[PDB]
Design a protein around this ligand. Structure first.
Ligand SMILES: O=P(O)(O)OC[C@H]1O[C@@H](O)[C@H](O)[C@@H](O)[C@@H]1O
Ligand SMILES: O=P(O)(O)OC[C@H]1O[C@@H](O)[C@H](O)[C@@H](O)[C@@H]1O
Lengths: 247, 253
C-alpha cells in the first residue's frame, strides 16, 4: 500500500489519498512528467462508465495531458475547462490543456469561449448565449476535477493580474492559489479571480478531485491549500512532500 | 513530375481541370474514404499550393472541417519568412468545437509559426445580444481583417452530411431537403447547378466576397464527395482544387 511518507502526508493534509513520485520537480524537470504519468493512472482508476472531467490549466496539468493515453476500458470521456479565462497565456489556459488532454485520451471536449478584453455588455451577452450556457451546465455536472496548485505570488505575477488585485493579494497574505482562488495560510479564500464556470462551493459535489502539484518551492502552498478539508487525492513528489513533512 | 506522370495523375489533373474549369487541379493518389493517409496527403499538397501562392504579406482565411485540419497538421513554417496572419472565414457555423474554423485557424497558425485572430460571434445570439457584440472593437477588428483576406482555404462537403454534422434546426433541414441541396462550402448549401439554396447566417466572409480573394484553394476528396465537388464547380469560382483519385475518378466516370 502507501509508504510511510504517503501515509503521513494523507493524515497531515486530510487527503482522500496521497500519491508521491520520486525526486524534486524543481531540481529534476522530468519529475513533472512522472507526476503526469501517475495522475493519468489515478484518473483511470476513478473513471465510471461515463465521465465529465473538468480540468485547469498550468504546466503541471499540461504534463498530465502529455502523458494521457486512451482508456483500455473504453469508458465515455468528455473533458471541459473548470473555469473561463484566468489571465494565463495561451499555453497555460485551461481551454488549451482541455483540448490536449481530450485528444490524447481519444475523448471529446467542449471549450468556454469567453474573451478577453470585451465590454461588460458584450460579456454578459456572451455568457447568456445557448452554446456557452450548455458548457457551463456540463461543468456543473463534472464527475472529476483535475487541478494544479501554485504559490500565490508566482501565480499572480504569471497571470495578467491588475495592480489593485496584486496589492489585495499581498495585503491579505495569500500564500497559495488553485483554480482562480487565492488562499491564506489557514486555507481561507482571500481573493478570487472573477470567471464563469466552477466555483469553490461546487467542488464538494464532485466525486473525484485530483490535485497535481509538486516541487520543493510549493511545499508551503500545498500545506496551506489543504488546511481545509478538500476530500482530494494529491499527486505530488518527494520534493514537496519531504519539505512539507520536515523529512 | 515523373511520379505524377507514371501514376497517371498528370493526365487526370489535366482532365479534371478542364472538366471543372479550375484555375488548377492537384490530385493525390488513392481514396480518402478508404485510406486515412490520403487525407494527410491532400493536406500536404494544399500546403505546397499555399506556399507557392503566398506574397510578402498574407491574410489567410480558413474554414473548419477534418480536411482543413489535415492542411493545418501538414503545415510548416515558411522558409521565406513571409508575413502570415490566419483568420477564420466566418463565425459559428454550428460545428462541434474540434471542427470549427477557429480551431483549425489556431492550429494552422501555430504550425506555420504565424499569427492568428479568432472570431467569437456565436450563431444563437439574440437580436439584442448580436447588436451589442457586433460593435465591439475586437469583433470589428477581426471582421475587417477577414475583409482583406489575400487567400481562402476551404473544404467542400455533401449537403446531407454537413446538415447532419452541424446542429441544424428542423426548419433549415426542411429547406435544404426541399431545394435539393447537394453540396456545401463555408456555410452555403448549393444545388446541382451550383446555385445557393440555403445560407447559414454568420458574420465574416460572404459568398460575394470570394471574388475579391486572388488565391482560393479548395481541399476536398473521397469518392463520397464526387457529386458535391462537381456541383460546387458548376459556377465560376476562380479556384484551385486539391483532391484525390477517389473523388476525381468517380467524377470523371
Ligand atoms: O502547474 P503550474 O504551472 O505550477 O500552475 C498551477 C496553476 O495553474 C493554473 O492556471 C490553475 O488554474 C491553478 O489550479 C494552478 O494553481
Ligand atoms: O473536411 P470535412 O470534414 O469533410 O468537412 C468539410 C466542411 O467543413 C465545414 O466546417 C466548412 O465550413 C466547409 O467549407 C466544408 O464543406
Amino acid at each position: 500500500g502507501l509508504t510511510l511518507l504517503e501515509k503521513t502526508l494523507k493524515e497531515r493534509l486530510n487527503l482522500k489519498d496521497a500519491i508521491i513520485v520520486s525526486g524534486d520537480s524543481d531540481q529534476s524537470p522530468w519529475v513533472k512528467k512522472e507526476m503526469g504519468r501517475a495522475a493519468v493512472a489515478c484518473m483511470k482508476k476513478r473513471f465510471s462508465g461515463k465521465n465529465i472531467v473538468a480540468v485547469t490549466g498550468g504546466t503541471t496539468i499540461e504534463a498530465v495531458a502529455e502523458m494521457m493515453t486512451p482508456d483500455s476500458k473504453n469508458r465515455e470521456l468528455l473533458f471541459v475547462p473548470a473555469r473561463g479565462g484566468l489571465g494565463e497565456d495561451v499555453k497555460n489556459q485551461a481551454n488549451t490543456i482541455c483540448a490536449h488532454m481530450a485528444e490524447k485520451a481519444s475523448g471529446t471536449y467542449r471549450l468556454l469561449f469567453v474573451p478577453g478584453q470585451l465590454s461588460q455588455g458584450a460579456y454578459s451577452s456572451i455568457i447568456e448565449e445557448p452554446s456557452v450556457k450548455e458548457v457551463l451546465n456540463t461543468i456543473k455536472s463534472a464527475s472529476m476535477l483535475v487541478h494544479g496548485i501554485g504559490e500565490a505570488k508566482t501565480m499572480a505575477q504569471r497571470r495578467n493580474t491588475p495592480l489593485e488585485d496584486l496589492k489585495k493579494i499581498d495585503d491579505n497574505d495569500a500564500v497559495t492559489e488553485a483554480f482562480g482562488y487565492y488562499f491564506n495560510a489557514d486555507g481561507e479564500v482571500v481573493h478570487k479571480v472573477h470567471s464563469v464556470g466552477m466555483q469553490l462551493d461546487d467542488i464538494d459535489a464532485i466525486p473525484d478531485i485530483i490535485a497535481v502539484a509538486g516541487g520543493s518551492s510549493k511545499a508551503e502552498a500545498i500545506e496551506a491549500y489543504f488546511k481545509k478539508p478538500r476530500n482530494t487525492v494529491l499527486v505530488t513528489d518527494e520534493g514537496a512532500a519531504k519539505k512539507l513533512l520536515r523529512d
